[PDB]
Amino acid sequence: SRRWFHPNITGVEAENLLLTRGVDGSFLARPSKSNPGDFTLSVRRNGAVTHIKIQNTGDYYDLYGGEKFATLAELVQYYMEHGDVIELKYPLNCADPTSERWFHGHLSGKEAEKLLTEKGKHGSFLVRESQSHPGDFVLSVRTGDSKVTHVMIRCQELKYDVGGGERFDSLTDLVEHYKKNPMVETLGTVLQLKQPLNTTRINAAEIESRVRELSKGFWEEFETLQQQECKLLYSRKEGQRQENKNKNRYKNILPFDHTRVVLHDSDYINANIIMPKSYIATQGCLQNTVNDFWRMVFQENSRVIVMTTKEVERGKSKCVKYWPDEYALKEYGVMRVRNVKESAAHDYTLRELKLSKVGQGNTERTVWQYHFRTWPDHGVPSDPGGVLDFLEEVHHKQESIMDAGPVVVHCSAGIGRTGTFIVIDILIDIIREKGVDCDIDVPKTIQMVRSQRSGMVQTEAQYRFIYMAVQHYIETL
Ligand SMILES: Nc1nc2ccc(Sc3cccc(Cl)c3Cl)nc2[nH]1
């Protein structure tokens, strides 16, 4: 559901809501007003409201006095199923419809009809503020293969209704009810609420116009996408096994069982297959996971590794050195690696590595390691040029290699900068194959990658970087 997230609420409003409408164990999560980019977990315990900081600079959701999580929905689920104790028992539900995909706010019946004509199909819908009745709403549906129907939504004592029957405490409750139990028109027409009207899918050539519309917008679009993360709470059982605990960099940032990379000749690595050319999104190696990392690269026939972290950042180990020094030969378990040559560029270093299995002459292949070294400690690069140029080179290397396996992409936890690189690369690959005249949907593409690994793309800063990267790529064409 993800109803416990309140997007437009202050700390005082949150305390008031938990005191007057909540009980002990009641909680909500919201964006931090005193430091944008951060979040606050507001909890009621023994008659009083406490506020707990969640930070995210781009790698994970770091909860004060708690753990590091891939998403807020994953954090909430962990504490619900599990300096004294704070109990998360009861979500305080938000009635605000702003982050709902179908909510459009200020829109006319003429304009809603135009948008439903252009992008709509049978069962496409939206909810907008009423023109004639200020404070009321309008549900606009498309039916057929075709027509558009407008259903008036009355707001009477902050409860919503369609003229009769049930009175709902929020537009969400009304939308959910009439989605399960569709309204039938007198003459037979079933007003099916199949899917919300798409607004994010744009033609590639027109990216500059949307970036301008969102630069006035980016925050609202991202948060609508974040609201959809509750649909991606897939099982991560293999990652929770006792034998696999110390193979994870962050205890609760785990690979989905259905997409994890299974090792066949144990079977565990914290990595997932990303299918849009495919990728392996993984974490930075631990001392005890270097061998399994090389077994993964060898088994998957990967010929290209993208590393988007320094070994050490802010005096903390982000990835152990899994490759030999230049000209040196090392043995990592059954795997053998030679670092043939290192090439230094402005933003990155290329390492030409020869990988083979010990005792097997013929299994040798070149593995090209692209190590981006200039990504800032916090946030995203100011300009996308460097990232795009690095990515163009990586794409060309992979393209030149006959039957190359997935491209391996890693940072620290392997969800933020990793998620960001993979998404930019997916969107650009669409534009190089189709041209300026093609459709691109940034939130749709992210949602698709997020169903394959938790919290792929962590922040609004990264979200805006993906848009700026795409815009830059289209501009230099
Ligand atoms: N109005 C409006 N703004 C939005 C911002 C983000 C999203 S998320 C999304 C977008 C496309 C496809 C899929 Cl599958 C998803 Cl989940 N939907 C929105 N609708």
Side-chain angles (χ1 to χ4, degrees), residues 100-104 196-201 220-226 228 231 441-445 447-448 463:
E100 296 278 6
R101 294 195 58 212
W102 39 260
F103 193 75
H104 287 245
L197 169 70
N198 185 293
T199 43
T200 56
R201 170 178 65 245
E220 299 272 41
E221 194 182 276
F222 186 63
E223 282 306 328
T224 302
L225 170 69
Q226 303 297 80
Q228 297 296 288
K231 290 179 169 167
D441 206 335
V442 179
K444 189 187 169 210
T445 304
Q447 189 69 4
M448 179 269 299
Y463 191 74

Coordinates of all heavy atoms in Angstrom, one line a residue, residues 100-104 196-201 220-226 228 231 441-445 447-448 463, ligand 1:
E100 N -0.1 9.8 -6.4 CA -0.8 8.7 -7.0 C -0.7 8.9 -8.5 O -0.7 10.0 -9.0 CB -2.3 8.7 -6.7 CG -2.6 8.4 -5.2 CD -2.6 6.9 -4.7 OE1 -2.2 6.0 -5.5 OE2 -2.9 6.7 -3.5
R101 N -0.4 7.8 -9.3 CA -0.2 7.9 -10.7 C -1.4 8.5 -11.5 O -1.1 9.2 -12.4 CB 0.1 6.5 -11.2 CG 1.5 5.9 -10.7 CD 1.9 4.7 -11.5 NE 2.1 5.0 -13.0 CZ 1.9 4.2 -13.9 NH1 1.6 2.9 -13.7 NH2 2.0 4.6 -15.2
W102 N -2.6 8.2 -11.0 CA -3.8 8.7 -11.7 C -4.3 10.1 -11.3 O -5.2 10.6 -11.9 CB -5.0 7.7 -11.4 CG -5.0 7.1 -10.0 CD1 -4.5 5.9 -9.7 CD2 -5.4 7.7 -8.8 NE1 -4.7 5.7 -8.3 CE2 -5.2 6.8 -7.8 CE3 -6.0 9.0 -8.5 CZ2 -5.6 7.1 -6.4 CZ3 -6.3 9.3 -7.2 CH2 -6.1 8.3 -6.2
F103 N -3.6 10.7 -10.2 CA -4.0 12.0 -9.8 C -3.3 13.2 -10.6 O -2.1 13.2 -10.7 CB -3.7 12.2 -8.3 CG -4.3 13.5 -7.8 CD1 -5.7 13.5 -7.5 CD2 -3.6 14.6 -7.5 CE1 -6.3 14.7 -7.0 CE2 -4.2 15.8 -7.0 CZ -5.5 15.8 -6.8
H104 N -4.1 14.0 -11.2 CA -3.6 15.1 -12.1 C -3.8 16.6 -11.6 O -3.3 17.5 -12.2 CB -4.3 15.0 -13.5 CG -3.7 13.9 -14.3 ND1 -3.0 14.1 -15.4 CD2 -3.7 12.5 -14.0 CE1 -2.6 12.9 -15.9 NE2 -3.1 11.9 -15.1
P196 N -3.7 3.7 -14.9 CA -3.7 5.2 -14.9 C -3.2 5.7 -16.2 O -2.5 4.9 -16.9 CB -2.8 5.5 -13.7 CG -1.9 4.4 -13.6 CD -2.7 3.2 -13.9
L197 N -3.5 6.9 -16.6 CA -3.1 7.5 -17.8 C -1.6 7.8 -17.7 O -1.1 8.5 -16.8 CB -3.9 8.8 -18.2 CG -3.3 9.7 -19.3 CD1 -3.5 9.0 -20.7 CD2 -4.0 11.0 -19.4
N198 N -0.8 7.4 -18.7 CA 0.7 7.6 -18.7 C 0.9 9.1 -19.0 O 0.3 9.7 -19.9 CB 1.4 6.8 -19.8 CG 2.9 6.9 -19.8 OD1 3.4 7.9 -20.1 ND2 3.5 5.9 -19.2
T199 N 1.9 9.7 -18.2 CA 2.2 11.1 -18.5 C 3.7 11.3 -18.6 O 4.2 12.4 -19.1 CB 1.6 12.0 -17.4 OG1 1.8 11.4 -16.1 CG2 0.2 12.3 -17.6
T200 N 4.5 10.3 -18.2 CA 5.9 10.4 -18.2 C 6.6 10.0 -19.5 O 7.7 10.4 -19.8 CB 6.4 9.6 -17.0 OG1 5.9 8.3 -17.1 CG2 6.0 10.2 -15.7
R201 N 5.9 9.1 -20.4 CA 6.4 8.7 -21.7 C 6.5 9.9 -22.7 O 5.5 10.4 -23.1 CB 5.7 7.5 -22.3 CG 6.0 7.2 -23.7 CD 5.3 6.0 -24.3 NE 3.8 6.2 -24.4 CZ 2.9 5.6 -23.7 NH1 3.3 4.6 -22.8 NH2 1.6 5.8 -23.9
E220 N 8.2 15.8 -7.6 CA 6.8 15.2 -7.6 C 6.8 13.9 -8.4 O 6.3 12.9 -8.0 CB 5.8 16.2 -8.1 CG 5.7 17.4 -7.2 CD 4.7 17.4 -6.0 OE1 4.6 16.3 -5.3 OE2 4.0 18.4 -5.7
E221 N 7.5 13.9 -9.6 CA 7.6 12.8 -10.5 C 8.3 11.6 -9.8 O 7.8 10.5 -9.8 CB 8.2 13.1 -11.8 CG 8.0 12.0 -12.9 CD 8.7 12.4 -14.2 OE1 8.1 13.1 -15.0 OE2 9.9 12.0 -14.4
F222 N 9.5 11.9 -9.2 CA 10.3 10.8 -8.4 C 9.4 10.2 -7.3 O 9.4 9.0 -7.2 CB 11.6 11.4 -7.9 CG 12.5 10.4 -7.2 CD1 13.1 9.4 -8.0 CD2 12.8 10.5 -5.9 CE1 14.0 8.5 -7.4 CE2 13.7 9.6 -5.3 CZ 14.3 8.6 -6.0
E223 N 8.8 11.0 -6.5 CA 8.0 10.5 -5.3 C 6.8 9.7 -5.8 O 6.5 8.8 -5.0 CB 7.7 11.7 -4.4 CG 8.8 12.1 -3.5 CD 9.5 11.0 -2.7 OE1 8.7 10.0 -2.3 OE2 10.7 11.1 -2.5
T224 N 6.3 10.0 -7.0 CA 5.2 9.2 -7.5 C 5.7 7.8 -7.8 O 5.1 6.8 -7.5 CB 4.5 9.9 -8.7 OG1 4.0 11.1 -8.3 CG2 3.3 9.0 -9.3
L225 N 6.9 7.7 -8.4 CA 7.6 6.5 -8.7 C 8.0 5.8 -7.4 O 7.8 4.6 -7.3 CB 8.9 6.8 -9.5 CG 9.9 5.6 -9.7 CD1 9.3 4.6 -10.6 CD2 11.3 6.2 -10.3
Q226 N 8.5 6.5 -6.4 CA 8.8 5.9 -5.1 C 7.6 5.2 -4.4 O 7.7 4.2 -3.8 CB 9.4 6.9 -4.1 CG 10.6 7.5 -4.6 CD 11.8 6.5 -4.8 OE1 11.8 5.9 -5.8 NE2 12.7 6.5 -3.9
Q228 N 5.4 3.5 -5.9 CA 5.2 2.2 -6.6 C 6.1 1.1 -6.1 O 6.0 -0.1 -6.5 CB 5.3 2.4 -8.1 CG 4.2 3.3 -8.7 CD 2.8 2.7 -8.5 OE1 2.4 1.7 -9.2 NE2 2.0 3.4 -7.7
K231 N 5.2 -2.6 -4.5 CA 4.8 -3.7 -5.4 C 6.1 -4.6 -5.7 O 5.9 -5.7 -6.3 CB 4.4 -3.1 -6.8 CG 3.0 -2.4 -6.6 CD 2.5 -1.8 -7.9 CE 1.1 -1.4 -7.9 NZ 0.7 -0.5 -9.0
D441 N 10.6 6.5 -21.5 CA 9.9 6.6 -20.2 C 10.8 6.3 -19.0 O 11.0 5.1 -18.6 CB 8.6 5.7 -20.2 CG 7.5 6.1 -19.3 OD1 7.8 6.8 -18.3 OD2 6.4 5.7 -19.5
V442 N 11.5 7.3 -18.5 CA 12.5 7.3 -17.4 C 11.9 6.5 -16.1 O 12.5 5.6 -15.7 CB 13.1 8.6 -17.0 CG1 14.1 8.5 -15.9 CG2 13.8 9.2 -18.2
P443 N 10.7 6.9 -15.6 CA 10.1 6.2 -14.4 C 9.8 4.7 -14.7 O 9.9 3.9 -13.8 CB 8.9 6.9 -14.0 CG 8.9 8.2 -14.7 CD 9.7 8.0 -16.0
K444 N 9.3 4.4 -15.9 CA 8.9 3.1 -16.3 C 10.1 2.2 -16.4 O 10.1 1.1 -15.9 CB 8.2 3.1 -17.7 CG 7.6 1.7 -18.1 CD 7.1 1.7 -19.5 CE 6.8 0.2 -19.9 NZ 6.9 0.1 -21.4
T445 N 11.2 2.7 -17.0 CA 12.5 2.0 -17.1 C 13.1 1.7 -15.7 O 13.6 0.6 -15.5 CB 13.4 2.7 -18.1 OG1 12.8 2.9 -19.3 CG2 14.8 2.0 -18.3
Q447 N 11.4 1.4 -12.8 CA 10.5 0.5 -12.1 C 10.8 -0.9 -12.6 O 10.9 -1.9 -11.8 CB 9.0 0.8 -12.5 CG 8.0 0.0 -11.7 CD 7.9 0.3 -10.2 OE1 8.6 1.2 -9.6 NE2 7.1 -0.5 -9.5
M448 N 11.1 -1.1 -13.9 CA 11.5 -2.4 -14.6 C 12.8 -2.9 -14.0 O 12.9 -4.1 -13.7 CB 11.5 -2.2 -16.1 CG 11.9 -3.4 -16.9 SD 13.7 -3.6 -17.2 CE 14.0 -2.0 -18.2
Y463 N 18.0 10.7 -9.9 CA 16.8 10.7 -10.9 C 17.0 11.9 -11.9 O 16.8 11.6 -13.1 CB 15.5 10.9 -10.1 CG 14.3 10.6 -10.9 CD1 13.9 9.4 -11.3 CD2 13.5 11.7 -11.3 CE1 12.7 9.1 -12.0 CE2 12.3 11.5 -12.0 CZ 11.9 10.2 -12.4 OH 10.8 9.9 -13.1
Ligands
LIG1 N1 1.4 11.3 -13.4 C1 2.4 10.4 -13.1 N2 3.6 10.8 -12.8 C2 4.3 9.7 -12.5 C3 5.6 9.6 -12.1 C4 6.1 8.2 -11.9 C5 5.2 7.2 -12.3 S1 5.8 5.5 -12.0 C6 5.6 4.7 -13.6 C7 5.6 5.5 -14.8 C8 5.5 4.8 -16.0 C9 5.3 3.4 -16.0 C10 5.3 2.7 -14.8 CL1 5.2 0.9 -14.7 C11 5.5 3.3 -13.6 CL2 5.5 2.5 -12.1 N3 3.9 7.4 -12.7 C12 3.5 8.6 -12.8 N4 2.3 9.1 -13.2

